[PDB]
Every structure is written in C-alpha cells, then in structure tokens.
C-alpha cells in the first residue's frame, strides 16, 4: 500500500526509518534525512514534528539526495500519505485578498505562472472545492511548497506560509 523509507545519508545509506501510515514524530529516531524511497503512495513529508516547518510532496520513486524532492535542509520529522480524490475531481478558487475577498479566479487546471495567467504573485485566500493541490513560492513549481488538502484557507498562514508569495500551483494526481 502506502510505504515510505527515510535514510540519514545520501544514496540510501545510514540509519533507516520506515512508515506505512501517518507518523507525527520520528525526530528521536532519525537525526537527518538525505535520501528517501517511496515504495507506494504519494506522501507529504515535513521538517518538524506534527506536520510543521518546510513540507514536500513525493510520489513513488527513488530520491538519493534531499535536493531530489526540492528539500531545503537535511531535517525531516513527520509524514502523512496524501489522500487523492477517488473520483479524480480537482477545482480551486484563488483570491486576491484574505477572507475570500477581492478578485477571484476558479480553475481545474495547473498553473505554472500565476503572473502570466492571473496577473498575481501573491494569493491571500483559497477554497479547494475539489481534490488536493500544492502552492509554490516560486514560478513553475520551484521553491517552498504548501499542501492544500483542506477545504478553506482564509489567510496564507492557513497553508503554512508566513509569506503571501505564491507564483505557481498544481494538482496532486495519481
Ligand atoms: Mg490520511
């Protein structure tokens, strides 16, 4: 089913931690993470316990360095499998201002450049009408990532961002 393996060293070496479920805190077991194998499923992995700090989405595959999942440092402490919609539906509303105010756009497609498409480089609230999405701090799915797997986000901090910068977004698909 869903299975992920974390390694302390690059190239799948060093101490290993395995998770086949949600794992809110493995910080006392693994002191650093430099490679991952996702045997099955799509996972959200997090820098700090209880799904906090930097986060990253990893589908099935082999990741011999943290840079391979766009990791921003060597620290991972928690993880959870992403629940994708069984009916495969995806739809999001993005808003210029907080609390669902200002200009709104609705889309069912990915967006590698919010500036090109919508003339914005910040998003201040969002409703995830269907499915599961990721916001990115930089264009074209680069930089820090923010998982949007809840229904409503009133302010950027609701998706884990201290900065309102969002320059691309996409769906997490099977
Ligand atoms: Mg779950």
Swiss-Prot record:
Comment on protein domains: Has a two-domain beta-structure, folded into four very similar Greek key motifs.
A Pfam family matched in the record: Crystall
InterPro entries the record matches: Beta/Gamma-Crystallin (IPR050252), Beta/gamma_crystallin (IPR001064), G_crystallin-like (IPR011024)
Assembly and oligomerization: Monomer.
Phenotype when changing residue 22 to G: In CTRCT20; uncertain significance
Disease affiliated with this protein: Cataract 20, multiple types: An opacification of the crystalline lens of the eye that frequently results in visual impairment or blindness. Opacities vary in morphology, are often confined to a portion of the lens, and may be static or progressive. In general, the more posteriorly located and dense an opacity, the greater the impact on visual function. CTRCT20 includes progressive polymorphic anterior, posterior, or peripheral cortical.
Molecular-function GO terms, alphabetical: structural constituent of eye lens
Protein name: Gamma-crystallin S
PROSITE patterns, sorted: CRYSTALLIN_BETA_GAMMA
Positions of the UniProt region annotated as Connecting peptide: 84-89
Species: Homo sapiens
Gene3D superfamilies membership: Crystallins
């Amino acid at each position: 089913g869903t299975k992920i393996t974390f390694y302390e060293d690059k190239d799948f070496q060093g101490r290993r931690y395995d998770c086949d479920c949600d794992c809110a805190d493995f910080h006392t077991y693994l002191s650093r993470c430099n490679s991952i194998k996702v045997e099955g499923g799509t996972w959200a992995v997090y820098e700090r316990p209880d799904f906090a700090g930097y986060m990253y989405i990893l589908p099935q595959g082999e990741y011999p360095e943290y840079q391979r999942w766009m990791g921003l440092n060597d620290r991972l402490s928690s993880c959870r499998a992403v629940h994708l919609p069984s009916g495969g539906e995806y739809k999001i509303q993005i808003f210029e201002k907080g609390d669902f105010s200002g200009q709104m756009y609705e889309t069912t497609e990915d967006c590698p450049s919010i500036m090109e498409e919508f003339h914005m480089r910040e998003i201040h609230s969002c409703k995830v009408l269907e499915g599961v999405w990721i916001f990115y701090e930089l264009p074209d799915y680069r930089g820090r990532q923010y998982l949007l797997d809840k229904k409503e986000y009133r302010k950027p901090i609701d998706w884990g961002a201290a900065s309102p910068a969002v320059q691309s977004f996409r769906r997490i698909v099977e």
